Amino acid sequence: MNTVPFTSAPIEVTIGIDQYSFNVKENQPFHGIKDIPIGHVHVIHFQHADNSSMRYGYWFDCRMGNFYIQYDPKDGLYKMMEERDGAKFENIVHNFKERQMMVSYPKIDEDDTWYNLTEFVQMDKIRKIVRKDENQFSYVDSSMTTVQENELSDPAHSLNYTVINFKSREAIRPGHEMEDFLDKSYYLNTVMLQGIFKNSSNYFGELQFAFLNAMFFGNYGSSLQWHAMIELICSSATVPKHMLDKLDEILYYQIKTLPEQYSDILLNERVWNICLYSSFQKNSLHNTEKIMENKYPELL
Amino acid sequence: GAMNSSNYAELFNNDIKLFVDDTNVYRVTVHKTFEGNVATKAINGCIFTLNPKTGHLFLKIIHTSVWAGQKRLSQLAKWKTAEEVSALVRSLPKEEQPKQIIVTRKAMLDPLEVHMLDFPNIAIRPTELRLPFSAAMSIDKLSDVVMKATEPQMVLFNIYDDWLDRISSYTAFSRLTLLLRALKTNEESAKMILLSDPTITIKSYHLWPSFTDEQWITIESQMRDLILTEYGRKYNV
């Protein structure tokens, strides 16, 4: 189990750790989160009590270093930092636990929720989407635009998701215009899977990282990317049997975890009615369709 | 963006553009079979591609053989249209390719866009206008060349005859569409009106009668009267 200590908490803030969150009061003696399951990626995120705008946070993996939070009063935010002195870090962690100033990552043992939302998410792939290679952890926030969005301004602070565009030369082979635009299997299986992602696990991981950025930061471009990756598959007549069964699980947990009140801005009506009822794959997402009908019948 | 009554005079500036109308590309007759089911029989059709500034019409004839062995023909027909319009553009000198293509039905946007990917700087636009180009097969000489075709074929016309020698393209297009509107709403009456007088003929190289300026005025007034009468009839107004 791992620990992320905080130096202090100088300002009132709601803290998230994966799908959990806690309110922390200004200068409350709060010094970090313990018991964080090793083995997965994690995200620790922030919403100031004063600015309900700009949710921001950090994706990280405890196997890649000792990470801690410290508020910066020049930049006005909780910053993730890495302690390179292992001994110094055990020393702080042990002292705070002894003083019991830390909340415990509150995992229910039956619950695979987080695993199921990050199964294919790798930290090495994250750090290519959020390029900032002097850091082992990755910063994301509400307002960061994607590379495709930048095309239709600052590249250091962009999300470099894989560009999908149904009306592009990439997606459409000359002479198979109608075929390739109605049946995207070529684009999914040769261009994207064999071409760019190399395997379905990397595809699935980006899909999953995109949803979680949409859900946790309300990142609009990340929601766009998520829905594009779903549509590409659902509009493909030929998809490995193993990918469809894994997608149905992937989406199930994503729909299951979403805040009910956010279903209006996080779920694109068109894409879901297409995938569930019109596409090639309309009969192949049996768990996803059942949970959508029972939780969000209005949207369909 | 969409073409509508507001940006209507853009059609007559010097930026090259084409209308595409696909309504007569896939044409069928419906009939009963011996067992008493219903079957369709396709007939030859056409793509109505038109430069409203100059009157040049590119009449691409769609031979029934194009459909042989295909499914979902009404959908196929939108993709064929896009394929043929693309081939036309590719066939034109650069300085002649259009800067815009206006589709008369929003279903053509996606197929043309896909087929026009090689021409990113040609803008594909829909329209809100209710243009009557589906009546183009009420123009005898056009219906004849489509119905007599024995293979795929492209045939060039000027749909304004020589009108532009005396009127602006604004006025030419308005006469064209008033004419086609009348043919659409009551074909028999419209045609009666154009051809009642045997002494006014159609030149071999023309589509319409060689009316004098004054006679065109009587004609246009008759077509208007026709259209309004048919409207009163349709709605009991």
Separation of alpha carbons A86 and A65, rounded Å: 9
Q: Which residues of A touch B112 (CB under 8 A)?
A: none
Tokens 């123009």, residue? B139
Collapsing DSSP to helix, strand or coil, A73 comes out as coil
Amino acid (1-letter code) at residue B128? E
Give me the DSSP letters along A177-199: HHHHHH-THHIIIIIIIIIIISS
Tokens for A253, please give them.
Answer: 């947990």
B183 lies in the same domain as B97: no
In this structure, the number of other CB atoms found within 10 A of the CB of residue B62 comes to 26
CA separation for the pair B188, B143 (Å, rounded): 15
Joined tokens for residue B39: 């079957």
- For β-strands A66-72 and A32-36, DSSP reports them as unpaired
Long-range contact list for B140-145, CB < 8 A, 24+ apart? B141/B202, B141/B207, B142/B46, B142/B59, B142/B207, B145/B59, B145/B61
B91-97, long-range: CB < 8 A, 24+ apart: B96/B16, B97/B16, B97/B122
Q: How far apart are the first and last CA of chain A?
A: 42
B163, B194, B224 — which closes off a domain?
Answer: B163
The CATH number covering residue B182 comes to 1.20.80.40
Q: Please, are residues A6 and A101 in contact by the beta-carbon 8 Å criterion?
A: no
Q: Are residues A217 and A279 in the same domain?
A: yes
What sections of chain A are H helices per DSSP?
86-98, 113-118, 123-129, 147-151, 177-182, 185-186, 200-217, 220-234, 241-257, 263-266, 269-273, 286-295
Length of chain B: 237
Which residues, at least 6 apart from A113, have a Cβ–Cβ distance to it below 8 Å?
A: A19, A253, A256, A257
What's the domain count of chain B? 2
HSE-up (13 A, CA, CB side) for residue A80: 24
Residue A30 CA: distances (Å) to CA of A3, A91, A100, A208, B232: 13, 17, 9, 31, 80
- Given A87, A110, A143, the domain boundary residue is A143
Judged by CB atoms closer than 8 Å, whether chains meet at A177 and B76 is answered as no
* 8 Å CB contact between A56 and A143: no
Please check whether residues B155 and B170 belong to one and the same domain.
no
Residue A88: give the domain boundaries: 1-143
- Quick check: helix, strand or coil at residue A202? helix
Enumerate residues 59 to 78 of chain B having a beta carbon within 8 A of any beta carbon in chain A: 76
The answer on A226 and A137 residing in a single domain is no
What is the token pair recorded at A183? 């049946």
User: Which residue among A143, A165, A187 closes a domain?
Assistant: A143
Q: Within this chain, do residues A149 and A254 fall inside the same structural domain, yes or no?
A: yes
C-alpha span between B114 and A86 (Å, rounded)? 57
> Which residue do the tokens 């509400």 mark?
A142
- CA geometry: angle B17, B21, B27, nearest 5 deg: 160
Matching residue, tokens 């019409």: B57
Range of the domain at B28: 9-163
- Alpha-carbon distance values, B218 to B160, B194, B214, B225 (Å): 18, 10, 7, 11
Token pair for residue B193?
Answer: 């009106």
Residues of B in contact with A181 (CB under 8 A): 110-111, 114
Q: Do A167 and B113 touch (CB under 8 A)?
A: yes
DSSP 8-state secondary structure symbol assigned to residue A262: G
Identify the sign of the CA torsion B133, B137, B141, B143. Answer: positive
The bridge status of strand B100-103 relative to strand B17-21 is: parallel
Q: Which residue, B105, B79, B213, is CA-closest to A175? A: B79
Q: How many Cβ atoms sit within 10 Å of the Cβ of residue A95?
A: 12
Report how far residue A140's alpha carbon sits from residue A125's, in angstroms, rounded to the nearest whole number: 14
How many CB atoms are closer than 10 A to CB A256? 14
Instruction: Report how this structure was experimentally obtained.
Output: X-ray
Asked if A156 and A216 sit in the same domain, the reply is: yes
Nearest chain B residue to A165 by CA distance is B114
Q: Are strands A32-36 and A103-104 parallel, antiparallel or unpaired?
A: parallel
Give the resolution to one decimal, in Å.
1.9
Query: Is residue B4 in a domain?
Result: no
